[PDB]
Design a protein around this ligand. Structure first.
Ligand SMILES: O=[N+]([O-])c1ccc(O[C@@H]2O[C@H](CO)[C@@H](O[C@@H]3O[C@H](CO)[C@@H](O)[C@H](O)[C@H]3O)[C@H](O)[C@H]2F)c([N+](=O)[O-])c1
Length: 300
Protein backbone atom coordinates (compact mmCIF):
# COMPACT_ATOMS: atom_id res chain seq x y z
CA UNK A 1 0.00 0.00 0.00
CA UNK A 2 2.65 2.63 0.92
CA UNK A 3 4.69 2.45 -2.27
CA UNK A 4 1.61 2.02 -4.43
CA UNK A 5 0.11 5.16 -2.89
CA UNK A 6 3.18 7.41 -2.86
CA UNK A 7 5.12 5.94 -5.72
CA UNK A 8 8.14 7.74 -7.01
CA UNK A 9 9.78 9.89 -4.36
CA UNK A 10 11.64 13.07 -5.19
CA UNK A 11 12.94 16.28 -3.69
CA UNK A 12 10.99 19.49 -4.22
CA UNK A 13 12.14 22.73 -2.57
CA UNK A 14 14.23 20.79 -0.08
CA UNK A 15 11.42 18.42 0.93
CA UNK A 16 10.79 14.76 0.35
CA UNK A 17 7.61 14.46 -1.72
CA UNK A 18 5.61 11.73 -3.42
CA UNK A 19 4.72 11.42 -7.10
CA UNK A 20 1.84 13.91 -6.67
CA UNK A 21 4.13 16.43 -5.06
CA UNK A 22 2.83 16.03 -1.54
CA UNK A 23 5.19 15.90 1.42
CA UNK A 24 5.79 12.45 2.81
CA UNK A 25 7.59 11.32 5.90
CA UNK A 26 9.19 7.89 6.18
CA UNK A 27 9.63 6.29 9.60
CA UNK A 28 11.18 2.89 10.16
CA UNK A 29 13.95 0.73 11.47
CA UNK A 30 17.54 0.10 10.56
CA UNK A 31 19.12 -3.28 10.88
CA UNK A 32 22.28 -3.51 12.93
CA UNK A 33 25.30 -4.75 11.00
CA UNK A 34 24.20 -7.42 8.52
CA UNK A 35 27.39 -9.39 9.24
CA UNK A 36 26.36 -9.79 12.90
CA UNK A 37 22.57 -9.63 13.13
CA UNK A 38 21.35 -10.54 9.66
CA UNK A 39 18.94 -13.10 11.03
CA UNK A 40 16.61 -10.21 11.99
CA UNK A 41 16.37 -9.14 8.34
CA UNK A 42 13.82 -11.25 6.51
CA UNK A 43 10.44 -10.98 4.91
CA UNK A 44 8.58 -12.17 8.01
CA UNK A 45 10.22 -9.76 10.44
CA UNK A 46 9.85 -6.89 8.00
CA UNK A 47 6.18 -7.77 7.50
CA UNK A 48 5.70 -7.77 11.29
CA UNK A 49 7.37 -4.35 11.50
CA UNK A 50 5.11 -3.08 8.73
CA UNK A 51 1.92 -4.50 10.18
CA UNK A 52 2.45 -4.17 13.96
CA UNK A 53 4.75 -1.14 14.15
CA UNK A 54 3.60 0.71 11.04
CA UNK A 55 7.01 1.08 9.38
CA UNK A 56 7.11 2.45 5.86
CA UNK A 57 10.88 2.16 5.33
CA UNK A 58 13.56 -0.36 6.28
CA UNK A 59 17.29 0.33 6.27
CA UNK A 60 19.77 -2.42 5.45
CA UNK A 61 23.02 -1.47 7.22
CA UNK A 62 25.76 -3.20 5.25
CA UNK A 63 28.97 -2.47 7.11
CA UNK A 64 31.89 -2.29 4.75
CA UNK A 65 34.60 -2.96 7.34
CA UNK A 66 34.30 -4.68 10.79
CA UNK A 67 33.77 -8.04 9.09
CA UNK A 68 31.32 -6.60 6.58
CA UNK A 69 31.30 -6.44 2.80
CA UNK A 70 34.98 -5.81 2.12
CA UNK A 71 35.96 -8.79 4.32
CA UNK A 72 33.12 -11.04 3.24
CA UNK A 73 31.00 -9.80 0.34
CA UNK A 74 28.36 -12.46 0.87
CA UNK A 75 26.50 -9.91 2.93
CA UNK A 76 25.38 -8.13 -0.27
CA UNK A 77 22.98 -11.03 -0.73
CA UNK A 78 21.30 -10.09 2.54
CA UNK A 79 20.86 -6.56 1.22
CA UNK A 80 19.16 -8.10 -1.83
CA UNK A 81 16.90 -10.15 0.44
CA UNK A 82 15.91 -6.97 2.28
CA UNK A 83 15.24 -5.04 -0.92
CA UNK A 84 13.13 -7.87 -2.30
CA UNK A 85 11.15 -8.08 0.95
CA UNK A 86 10.51 -4.34 0.82
CA UNK A 87 9.31 -4.67 -2.78
CA UNK A 88 7.02 -7.53 -1.77
CA UNK A 89 5.73 -5.63 1.26
CA UNK A 90 5.29 -2.37 -0.68
CA UNK A 91 7.52 -0.28 1.60
CA UNK A 92 10.64 1.78 0.89
CA UNK A 93 14.15 0.45 1.51
CA UNK A 94 17.49 2.10 2.15
CA UNK A 95 20.61 0.40 0.86
CA UNK A 96 23.28 1.64 3.28
CA UNK A 97 27.00 1.42 2.42
CA UNK A 98 27.79 1.50 6.08
CA UNK A 99 31.21 3.06 6.53
CA UNK A 100 32.42 3.73 10.05
CA UNK A 101 35.93 2.63 11.06
CA UNK A 102 36.79 3.09 7.40
CA UNK A 103 36.14 6.74 8.16
CA UNK A 104 36.87 8.25 4.77
CA UNK A 105 34.43 7.07 2.09
CA UNK A 106 37.27 7.25 -0.41
CA UNK A 107 39.02 4.26 1.15
CA UNK A 108 36.67 1.75 -0.53
CA UNK A 109 35.34 3.99 -3.30
CA UNK A 110 36.16 1.55 -6.08
CA UNK A 111 34.21 -1.19 -4.30
CA UNK A 112 31.40 1.27 -3.58
CA UNK A 113 31.09 2.20 -7.25
CA UNK A 114 30.91 -1.47 -8.25
CA UNK A 115 28.42 -2.28 -5.52
CA UNK A 116 26.11 0.66 -6.38
CA UNK A 117 26.36 -0.17 -10.13
CA UNK A 118 25.15 -3.66 -9.32
CA UNK A 119 22.34 -2.55 -6.97
CA UNK A 120 21.09 0.20 -9.24
CA UNK A 121 21.16 -2.16 -12.24
CA UNK A 122 19.11 -4.73 -10.33
CA UNK A 123 16.68 -2.45 -8.58
CA UNK A 124 16.76 0.87 -10.39
CA UNK A 125 13.34 0.38 -11.99
CA UNK A 126 11.60 0.10 -8.66
CA UNK A 127 10.44 3.19 -6.73
CA UNK A 128 11.19 1.55 -3.39
CA UNK A 129 14.94 2.03 -3.39
CA UNK A 130 16.86 4.76 -1.61
CA UNK A 131 20.68 4.64 -1.88
CA UNK A 132 22.76 5.67 1.13
CA UNK A 133 26.29 5.91 -0.23
CA UNK A 134 28.36 6.60 2.90
CA UNK A 135 26.80 6.10 6.34
CA UNK A 136 29.11 8.14 8.62
CA UNK A 137 32.17 9.91 7.34
CA UNK A 138 34.19 10.87 10.38
CA UNK A 139 37.54 12.24 11.50
CA UNK A 140 38.99 15.74 11.38
CA UNK A 141 40.76 14.83 8.14
CA UNK A 142 37.52 13.94 6.34
CA UNK A 143 35.73 17.06 5.17
CA UNK A 144 32.79 17.76 2.95
CA UNK A 145 34.66 19.74 0.37
CA UNK A 146 37.82 17.67 0.21
CA UNK A 147 36.63 14.11 0.76
CA UNK A 148 32.88 13.56 0.91
CA UNK A 149 31.54 15.71 -1.91
CA UNK A 150 34.12 14.45 -4.44
CA UNK A 151 33.34 10.86 -3.37
CA UNK A 152 29.64 11.52 -3.97
CA UNK A 153 30.45 13.06 -7.35
CA UNK A 154 32.07 9.73 -8.34
CA UNK A 155 29.39 7.39 -7.01
CA UNK A 156 26.25 9.31 -7.95
CA UNK A 157 27.02 9.15 -11.72
CA UNK A 158 27.35 5.36 -11.47
CA UNK A 159 23.87 5.18 -9.89
CA UNK A 160 22.36 7.73 -12.23
CA UNK A 161 23.47 5.79 -15.29
CA UNK A 162 21.04 3.05 -14.16
CA UNK A 163 18.52 4.91 -12.03
CA UNK A 164 17.96 8.54 -12.99
CA UNK A 165 16.11 9.85 -10.00
CA UNK A 166 15.52 7.59 -6.97
CA UNK A 167 16.68 9.30 -3.78
CA UNK A 168 20.34 9.26 -2.81
CA UNK A 169 21.32 10.02 0.82
CA UNK A 170 24.87 11.34 1.24
CA UNK A 171 26.65 11.22 4.59
CA UNK A 172 28.14 14.30 6.17
CA UNK A 173 31.19 15.03 8.26
CA UNK A 174 31.66 14.29 11.94
CA UNK A 175 29.56 11.09 11.94
CA UNK A 176 26.90 12.63 9.69
CA UNK A 177 26.37 15.68 11.89
CA UNK A 178 27.99 18.41 9.79
CA UNK A 179 25.03 19.33 7.64
CA UNK A 180 26.05 22.99 7.88
CA UNK A 181 29.02 22.57 5.61
CA UNK A 182 27.15 20.31 3.16
CA UNK A 183 24.25 22.77 2.97
CA UNK A 184 26.66 25.57 2.06
CA UNK A 185 28.22 23.51 -0.73
CA UNK A 186 25.45 21.34 -2.12
CA UNK A 187 25.66 18.60 -4.73
CA UNK A 188 24.12 19.21 -8.13
CA UNK A 189 21.79 16.20 -8.28
CA UNK A 190 18.22 17.30 -7.56
CA UNK A 191 17.22 14.10 -5.77
CA UNK A 192 19.93 14.12 -3.12
CA UNK A 193 19.48 14.35 0.62
CA UNK A 194 22.11 14.81 3.30
CA UNK A 195 22.28 12.48 6.26
CA UNK A 196 21.92 13.78 9.77
CA UNK A 197 22.38 11.35 12.68
CA UNK A 198 21.69 11.92 16.39
CA UNK A 199 21.78 10.05 19.66
CA UNK A 200 19.45 11.13 22.46
CA UNK A 201 22.18 10.81 25.10
CA UNK A 202 23.65 13.98 23.62
CA UNK A 203 22.00 17.25 24.59
CA UNK A 204 20.61 18.26 21.18
CA UNK A 205 19.51 21.90 21.17
CA UNK A 206 22.32 23.23 19.01
CA UNK A 207 22.18 20.22 16.71
CA UNK A 208 18.49 20.98 16.06
CA UNK A 209 19.43 24.59 15.27
CA UNK A 210 22.10 23.32 12.83
CA UNK A 211 19.58 21.09 11.07
CA UNK A 212 17.37 24.15 10.74
CA UNK A 213 20.27 26.14 9.28
CA UNK A 214 20.75 23.42 6.68
CA UNK A 215 17.07 23.26 5.85
CA UNK A 216 17.12 27.04 5.43
CA UNK A 217 19.73 26.65 2.65
CA UNK A 218 17.30 24.48 0.74
CA UNK A 219 19.15 21.22 1.59
CA UNK A 220 17.00 18.15 2.13
CA UNK A 221 17.85 16.09 5.22
CA UNK A 222 17.13 12.45 5.98
CA UNK A 223 17.75 11.26 9.55
CA UNK A 224 18.90 7.87 8.32
CA UNK A 225 20.15 6.77 11.75
CA UNK A 226 19.26 7.87 15.25
CA UNK A 227 19.25 6.25 18.64
CA UNK A 228 17.65 6.56 22.04
CA UNK A 229 21.05 5.83 23.57
CA UNK A 230 24.38 7.56 23.79
CA UNK A 231 26.46 7.98 20.66
CA UNK A 232 28.14 4.60 21.27
CA UNK A 233 24.84 2.80 20.83
CA UNK A 234 24.80 2.01 24.57
CA UNK A 235 24.93 3.78 27.94
CA UNK A 236 21.36 4.38 28.98
CA UNK A 237 18.15 5.27 27.31
CA UNK A 238 17.21 8.94 27.01
CA UNK A 239 13.56 9.10 26.16
CA UNK A 240 12.95 12.68 27.14
CA UNK A 241 15.48 13.99 24.64
CA UNK A 242 14.37 11.36 22.10
CA UNK A 243 10.85 12.74 22.29
CA UNK A 244 12.13 16.28 21.74
CA UNK A 245 13.84 15.04 18.57
CA UNK A 246 10.72 13.11 17.49
CA UNK A 247 8.63 16.24 17.74
CA UNK A 248 11.29 18.30 15.93
CA UNK A 249 11.38 15.82 13.07
CA UNK A 250 7.63 15.86 12.73
CA UNK A 251 7.55 19.65 12.64
CA UNK A 252 10.28 19.71 9.95
CA UNK A 253 8.92 16.76 7.83
CA UNK A 254 12.08 14.77 8.45
CA UNK A 255 12.14 11.09 7.58
CA UNK A 256 13.99 8.72 9.86
CA UNK A 257 15.26 5.25 10.62
CA UNK A 258 15.98 4.14 14.18
CA UNK A 259 19.14 2.24 15.18
CA UNK A 260 18.65 -0.68 15.55
CA UNK A 261 16.79 -3.95 15.10
CA UNK A 262 18.79 -6.45 17.15
CA UNK A 263 18.74 -8.29 20.45
CA UNK A 264 22.26 -7.12 21.37
CA UNK A 265 22.60 -6.08 25.00
CA UNK A 266 22.97 -2.37 24.36
CA UNK A 267 20.49 0.34 25.09
CA UNK A 268 19.81 1.30 21.45
CA UNK A 269 18.82 -2.25 20.54
CA UNK A 270 15.07 -2.59 19.93
CA UNK A 271 14.70 -6.22 21.00
CA UNK A 272 15.32 -8.27 24.11
CA UNK A 273 17.68 -11.23 24.08
CA UNK A 274 14.93 -13.80 23.42
CA UNK A 275 13.09 -12.03 20.57
CA UNK A 276 12.17 -14.22 17.60
CA UNK A 277 14.13 -13.19 14.48
CA UNK A 278 11.00 -13.62 12.36
CA UNK A 279 8.83 -11.18 14.33
CA UNK A 280 5.68 -11.49 16.44
CA UNK A 281 7.24 -9.77 19.45
CA UNK A 282 5.27 -9.37 22.65
CA UNK A 283 5.71 -6.35 24.85
CA UNK A 284 8.18 -8.32 26.99
CA UNK A 285 10.36 -9.02 23.94
CA UNK A 286 10.83 -5.34 23.14
CA UNK A 287 13.48 -3.36 24.95
CA UNK A 288 12.72 0.00 26.50
CA UNK A 289 14.07 1.58 23.32
CA UNK A 290 12.04 -0.68 21.03
CA UNK A 291 8.87 -0.11 22.97
CA UNK A 292 9.29 3.65 22.56
CA UNK A 293 10.14 3.52 18.87
CA UNK A 294 7.21 1.22 18.12
CA UNK A 295 4.90 3.64 19.93
CA UNK A 296 6.27 6.57 17.93
CA UNK A 297 5.66 4.82 14.60
CA UNK A 298 2.22 3.52 15.62
CA UNK A 299 1.20 7.05 16.76
CA UNK A 300 2.25 8.33 13.39
O1 LIG B 1 30.70 10.40 18.38
N1 LIG B 1 29.79 10.14 17.69
O2 LIG B 1 29.10 11.09 17.37
C1 LIG B 1 29.45 8.90 17.10
C2 LIG B 1 28.26 8.78 16.41
C3 LIG B 1 27.87 7.59 15.78
C4 LIG B 1 28.69 6.44 15.81
O3 LIG B 1 28.42 5.24 15.20
C5 LIG B 1 27.14 5.14 14.51
O4 LIG B 1 26.01 4.98 15.41
C6 LIG B 1 25.84 3.70 16.06
C7 LIG B 1 26.06 3.91 17.55
O5 LIG B 1 27.43 4.25 17.83
C8 LIG B 1 26.78 2.66 15.45
O6 LIG B 1 26.35 1.39 15.93
C9 LIG B 1 27.22 0.84 16.91
O7 LIG B 1 28.37 0.44 16.19
C10 LIG B 1 29.37 -0.17 17.03
C11 LIG B 1 30.62 -0.33 16.18
O8 LIG B 1 30.29 -1.16 15.07
C12 LIG B 1 28.76 -1.47 17.55
O9 LIG B 1 29.72 -2.15 18.38
C13 LIG B 1 27.48 -1.16 18.34
O10 LIG B 1 26.88 -2.38 18.78
C14 LIG B 1 26.52 -0.38 17.44
O11 LIG B 1 25.37 0.00 18.16
C15 LIG B 1 26.61 2.73 13.94
O12 LIG B 1 27.30 1.70 13.29
C16 LIG B 1 27.28 4.02 13.47
F1 LIG B 1 26.69 4.40 12.28
C17 LIG B 1 29.95 6.54 16.56
N2 LIG B 1 30.79 5.45 16.67
O13 LIG B 1 30.48 4.32 16.35
O14 LIG B 1 31.84 5.70 17.29
C18 LIG B 1 30.29 7.76 17.17
Amino acid sequence: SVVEEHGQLSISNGELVNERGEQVQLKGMSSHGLQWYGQFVNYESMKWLRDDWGINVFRAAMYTSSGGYIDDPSVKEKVKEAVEAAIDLDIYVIIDWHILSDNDPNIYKEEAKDFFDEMSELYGDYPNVIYEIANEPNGSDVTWGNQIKPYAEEVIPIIRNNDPNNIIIVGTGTWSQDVHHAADNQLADPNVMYAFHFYAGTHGQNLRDQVDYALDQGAAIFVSEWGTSAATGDGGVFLDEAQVWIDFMDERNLSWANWSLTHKDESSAALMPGANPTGGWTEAELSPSGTFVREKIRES
